[PDB]
Design a protein around this ligand. Structure first.
Ligand code: CYC
Ligand code: CYC
Ligand code: NA
Ligand code: NA
Ligand code: NA
Ligand code: NA
Lengths: 517, 517
């Protein structure tokens, strides 16, 4: 009711939101919390009335066998084991309703963080319309081709194309988290009449810390009907804990209202989201949208997850391989320089005679060799005077092992005047008083924000309670990044460091030879 | 002095051995522990006398700058940062000894678990004989070929072949830890006149828990001279903690004596060991042996580690891809069965008409369909009577979601009589009273132990102290494993489970149709 300016309180409310203990359940399925070994129903979603014709009053304190028939759930005397649970997934359960009616579910069990058994019953449309056993062969062929020859981009595209082929989703995206946990849509496959989100960048707050954390424990989220009105667990608290049941790993947990409102604003009728995890860190999501409601049965979700994770394993290997390959390319430059340096009369002469190697060593476009009295400028550099003032600035600030920046202007303001040749600077001190410098030009870089980063959500405060809402503007923002070079890669800096080392060895060997001899 | 029978006390002594706080240092290099910001020497290895001509009495309490000249170690006012440290690695330091002498080191710094700065000085033979910049190109080409077409075995071989090419080691092995942390030598490249360890299996105690733990924190261990007599840190305790310095991440930490004795027994003069880590778990080691002493400088070790880890990243992807590919092959079998099952008059007829699909579904060689009154035997099975007794045994033991074993004889002893067709059994209950069974024959499997598993080391007790020694027998043992089938793979069990599910759906759909109609 009261429009609240975006605050520190509204941001730390967002990052601490207890979404995992929400008690609201998506209305197409039943959640039953079960006390072992009898499988006594201790909580049940209130949609049991409409689905089963039996109220929570009729069901709480009954055993699961009194409510459902099944083939595979026997009465056993101790708590269900992890292996037992995973083999129950999914299992057919059915109830006889009104009189002349089967209602058939596929049930999926898990034990939550506090040891409570949770059973989730999704309607079984036996096997009605979404095969993937055959589509697995097309997905496998696609992966096989990538493994023959591919860029990283080809892997991204295969994930989105094959998940969309298998599922029939109107839109499938690959969403990658960056260093600040902003998101980038790095691949997309969608209907031709839908607008592209490919290349769009989103604030960290769109998928906040509790949502990201959830995806580390729970690989898959599905919402088959965004407009489904959520129903409560009854009671809202678990009888044995007296507290809300932890639904981190729940299929049928209804999403936090603000995310639902976000999807509704976007015209999304159904979604499927699968996480890609590396070394316990959330790397990204396969994010699928449909414009209308859409059921994705458990086996199909698991097939998409299996394929996506096998492709992702191949993406890690591809990233590591490209890094190695680039290091090897740079090692050639290093080796040629060391060969010519130690062969020349004077080692600076060796360097100057091989400028494409010297520049190639760090992926750069200009360089300066400053040794003793001489200053040699190679490739595209600032003019001699500017380099001298820059050298002087580097000398006056306590000599690190290396200085590098991809936007020199914002720590050295006079660099605005040579932004077209040296927005980027890599400076290595050699024997204290000397320097090798490498230079890179401005490259304009555009961040295509999918919403306003400075107005990333909406907050209201009623009765002391802060409420948070998705942003109401659909405008796009492009941030045009200027005075910035391409970034320095770790292997380029290491290659530069390796040249420094080789020069230092030369100087020491020459000092040792003019002592001994 | 007193021969001690191998015990629980000697085994838990082995698993709790504090190797990381050993104060003995390999004699070719110096260790200095340094107090910041002055870099005051608080401990030093006692070989400083011979290497520098200066005793610990002369050095303790001096700053590093009083002892060594360098280009890159400046006096700075706060503790060295992680980025500063890693750029110092390696840095040239040199001392002037006797009078007319340089002694030159490459120094490598780290901050240990307790915040102490440790500097390790290995002699610099500038760049004297072991290039790898060029060999990186051959290693890269080898990796490139694997990525075009390869089995897992090809990846193992590339690691050992290229590390050996780059290093010149007499023997290079890939050592993989199994589920019990026994080791298997799964690849090897060695001089033709040396005996092969390829295919040998070793007890967990050969590389005990403290050694494995060390490799999670410290990727590389090197011992350039196994016969080098280790020298103490002086003092043996750090002045600021009053306790032994944690040398987990130390290059020059001398190995525990029993491992040295092991290497000496094996004729090893030098070693290099690089760990391969996945998801915080130690997967395996690249283990290199030379028959004589051998220096492997820091940069070469890091090059081997980088290559080995890039190949290992590709090995994870290959393992995931082969698993996926096998699941897809099995999914074809599943799909054909479901198609023929739902098309036949009766679904058992569908199964029986496609026996290569039914067997192929689980990688098995025989099967039994037991539904209601009929029992159909497919492929190589036990005789009808034996299958009936087995069915009866399965019925009497509370029905899991699945029973599988790769050695039926050791829980069902009468299975010894049909070991050639059903050493392995996969049994799935369907609708409670029915079963699908799959059968597999005995396949003899040999474990080539590299030493006696029942006498895996030697223990003595003198004066209350238990001492442990490497085993003294060089005999090999082969364990010939009998009455055992090939193991059931997870994807084969899942495929069988998927058939069960499909049959259950059929039965429910037929029960629903004969109710409604
Ligand atoms: C409202 C308070 C704020 C908010 C909160 C919020 N977000 C989520 C979860 C997700 N948000 C997304 C984001 C996107 N999906 C997309 O397709 C795109 C376009 C490329 C975006 C930006 C996604 C994928 C999730 C994961 C959940 C899912 O089912 O996919 C949570 C999670 C809530 C839950 O209960 O599970 C919350 C609380 N989001 C906003 O818009 C506001 C800033
Ligand atoms: C003596 C008490 C027991 C023992 C202890 C022990 N072992 C190690 C470390 C290693 N052992 C090996 C084992 C092998 N290397 C090989 O090439 C082969 C043949 C294939 C084997 C079996 C290896 C590779 C290591 C790692 C250390 C390394 O430098 O390579 C430790 C570690 C000690 C340390 O201080 O670092 C200890 C205490 N080993 C025995 O033989 C006895 C059972
Ligand atoms: Na019942
Ligand atoms: Na962009
Ligand atoms: Na000095
Ligand atoms: Na063997």
């Amino acid at each position: 009711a009261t429009t609240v300016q975006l605050s520190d309180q509204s941001l730390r409310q967002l990052e601490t939101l207890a979404i995992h203990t929400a008690h609201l359940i998506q209305p197409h399925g039943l959640v039953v919390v079960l006390q072992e070994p009898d499988l006594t129903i201790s909580q049940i979603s209130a949609n049991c009335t409409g689905i089963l014709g039996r109220s929570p009053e009729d069901l709480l304190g009954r055993t699961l066998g009194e409510v459902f028939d099944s083939f595979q759930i026997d009465p056993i005397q101790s708590r269900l084991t992890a292996g037992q649970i995973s083999s129950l997934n999914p299992s057919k359960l059915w109830a006889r309703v009104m009189g002349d009616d089967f209602v058939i579910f596929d049930g999926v069990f898990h034990r939550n963080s506090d040891g409570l058994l949770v059973c989730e019953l999704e309607p079984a449309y036996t096997s009605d319309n979404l095969p993937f056993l055959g589509f697995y062969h097309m997905a496998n062929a696609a992966l096989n081709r990538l493994r023959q020859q591919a860029n990283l981009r080809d892997f991204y595209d295969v994930i989105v194309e094959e998940v969309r082929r298998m599922t029939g989703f109107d839109r499938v995206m690959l969403y990658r988290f960056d260093e600040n946990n902003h998101g980038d849509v790095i691949a997309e496959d969608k209907r031709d009449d839908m607008e592209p989100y490919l290349g769009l960048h989103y604030p960290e707050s769109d998928i906040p810390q509790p949502a990201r954390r959830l995806f580390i424990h729970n690989p898959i989220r599905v919402i088959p009907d965004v407009y489904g009105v959520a129903v409560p667990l009854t009671p809202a608290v678990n009888p044995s804990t007296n507290r809300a049941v932890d639904l981190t790993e729940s299929i049928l947990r209804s999403a936090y209202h603000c995310h639902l409102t976000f999807l509704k604003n976007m015209g999304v009728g159904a979604s499927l989201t699968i996480s890609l995890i590396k070394d316990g860190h959330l790397w990204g999501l396969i994010a699928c949208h449909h414009q209308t409601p859409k059921v994705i049965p458990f086996e199909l979700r698991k097939a998409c997850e299996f394929f996506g994770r096998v492709v992702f394993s191949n993406i890690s290997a591809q990233e590591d391989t490209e890094t190695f390959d680039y290091r090897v390319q740079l090692a050639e430059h290093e080796a040629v320089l060391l060969d010519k340096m130690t062969t020349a009369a004077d080692f600076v002469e060796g360097l100057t005679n091989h400028p494409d190697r010297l520049l190639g060593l760090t992926g750069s476009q200009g360089a300066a060799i400053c040794f003793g009295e001489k200053l040699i400028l190679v490739g595209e550099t600032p003019d001699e005077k500017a380099v001298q003032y820059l050298l002087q600035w580097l000398e006056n600030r306590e000599v690190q092992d290396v200085f590098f920046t991809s936007s020199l202007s914002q720590i050295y303001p006079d660099a605005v005047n040579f932004k077209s040749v040296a927005s980027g600077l890599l400076a290595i001190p050699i024997a204290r008083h000397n320097f090798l410098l490498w230079f890179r030009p401005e490259v304009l870089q555009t961040v295509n924000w999918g919403g306003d980063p400075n107005h990333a959500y909406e907050a209201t405060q009623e009765d002391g309670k802060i409420e948070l809402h998705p942003r109401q503007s659909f405008d796009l923002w492009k941030e045009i990044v200027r005075l910035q070079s391409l970034p320095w890669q770790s292997v380029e800096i290491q290659s530069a460091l390796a040249l420094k080392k080789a020069i230092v060895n030369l100087i020491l060997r020459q000092a040792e030879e003019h002592h001994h001899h």
